[model samples]
Target: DPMVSKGEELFTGVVPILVELDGDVNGHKFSVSGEGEGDATYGKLTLKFICTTGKLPVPWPTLVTTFLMCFARYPDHMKRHDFFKSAMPEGYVQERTIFFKDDGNYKTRAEVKFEGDTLVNRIELKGIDFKEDGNILGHKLEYNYNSHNVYIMADKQKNGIKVNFKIRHNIEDGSVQLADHYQQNTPIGDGPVLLPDNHYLSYQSALSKDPNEKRDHMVLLEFVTAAGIT
Candidate 1:
């Protein structure tokens, strides 16, 4: 809190660069921060909703009427093979990200802070429905990650369907290490983040020495406004 009081903390929406452009950059057109001499405050949350079908065996077809009705009338591509009448086709993946300002509600929240050069981002998301009434339900969880070596503990969610997880990015080696309560402090996985092809590191082969194979790598250091998934 001392650092925040000093007005050194900054938050920016994490928008990604869709069209390939040269240079090492994260798409933050503007930033909001405290006001010591002069400033402001703002925030953003990044989330990914991957849509796939025919996997979940929900108890009743009545619950999914909202799901069928939504896609049945949307763009023509969603109706490629009469999805309104039958189950969603296999091998279909639709990815979407929601954007909303941090209004201090249970729906979503994002916080970015600096603990002595260690940039940490703590985010919480709950009850975001994809379909009309959420036949394809969303997840509720708290995710925290940082760009420094210090480890922050995750909250324990013993009831319902909530979960918490944390990650630490090793600045020296660029490996992102993850730990969750479900895994009991052991690293579930660790890897470098992937970036656009023209950047500098290789997520494909972390040790790749070929210059042509190298690409840009990044770690989240602030509030994310936009996010992408593959």
Candidate 2:
């Protein structure tokens, strides 16, 4: 019943915003995009959000743990020349490529592939030097869902990537509002309060660096729904 479970999880996470459920649902999809700086010249990060409906709630802890674990361990695994991969709920796969920057550009260091049921995710990181820097500079994260939602995360890890985490005015118009900066070691959140428009909540970050590059960072979170589901 994992497939059914996965469907339920997706539904719980994205139900309230389903346009079909409510024709007035203003923002069903969102995106965050931007760039910044660190030990290198510039870095970038992007994120997207969508909606779904099944009948269950995906454990929040499981979702957060997966992200944290991948974020913390994958770099080390790549350095060791070890293959790293993960499987999701239904029938989905994820692949990752790590790249390094030397001549003022990014190059690949390692690549990982993943496959499973009810889950499809892929990530590519540019400007990563496992031997020299030991961390990712700029990268992209994307997700695909058959009975769920698909999201994307792209960002530059530099000093000045003007980032924007905003709700789309519409599927056609890509206008967005500025969200936050690109400092390392910072916590971000819009707080517990939801927005009045219900389209988007606030976004905050607490990123910092050793010397402080002072570069602006941008982020984008986009959402899309299947025509059948809508």
Candidate 3:
């Protein structure tokens, strides 16, 4: 609603990276499309399709999907730990759990982990495969840790016939080149939005040391965009 009023709250978070892929199996073509966005803090990611060849398995109106995604503020990394959250967006409900688990991983790229039995929604941020005119064959969910990449392979079938699909989306740092594609992909009447001129303070460490991290190491007065102003 930010577009409707002056600085209506828009988006915040990792600002979320993106994902899209296309694949082929047994001469059949497949595709994938996806996008990840959250408040300047966190949110859910959805994807589309990528095409390679043949007619893929899908019914009309079969669109990209999702799953509840969130992050927690933990100790670690460079310029990284700042985006973590200690709570879910107010008014928004659900027992949220899922964040990078530390096992002596990179100071920057940690692993995505889940805690608690939290299937907060029906949308799956992964794959779905069904027959074009047949039955449910099989299913496979693909993901990777310690690696920042997107892969979807919904390959299955019955009898001797095999269905195929594969896709990948490379993450782009909004420096340039990709920004154009980002803008084009974004529907009009809505576009990139600037977060509220705000931030919180982090005190997990201390202001006495690592001064550069101070900006992100503490909480500020504005938690969750302050309810108004994007």
Writing each residue's lDDT as its tens digit, candidate 1 over 207-230 gives 112244222211121221111111
Model 2, TM vs. native: 0.20
Two-way TM-score contest, 1 vs 3, winner? 3
Q: Candidate 2, which segments miss by more than 4 Å at Cα? A: 14-92, 95-122, 126-214, 228-230
The residue-by-residue lDDT of candidate 2 on 1-230, one tens digit each, is 34323323332321111011110111122221222211100111122212133211211111110111111111221212101111112212222221112212122111111122111232222322223221111111111111121122222232111112221111112322111112111112211111111111122222222344232221222222111110
lDDT measured at residue 88 in model 1 versus the true structure, 0 to 100:
14
Q: Encode model 3's per-residue lDDT on 1-230: one tens digit a residue.
A: 32322211222333443333343322344454333333333222322223223344332112211112223221222112122121112112221111111101001111122223221222111222333322111111111111111111111121011111111212222211010000000111222222211222221110111345322111111112111112
Best by lDDT: 3
TM-scores for all predictions: 0.18, 0.20, 0.23
Residue pairs in steric clash, candidate 1?
Answer: 13-225, 14-224, 14-225, 14-226, 200-215, 200-216, 201-215
Superposed by TM-score, candidate 1 places the C-alpha of residue 135 at a distance from the truth, in angstroms, of 14
Residue 225, candidate 1: alpha-carbon lDDT: 15
Q: Among these predicted structures, which one has the highest TM-score?
A: 3
What lDDT would each prediction earn against the true structure? 0.20, 0.19, 0.21
**What's the C-alpha lDDT at position 151 in model 1?**
16
Cα RMSD (Å) per model? 24.3, 21.7, 20.1
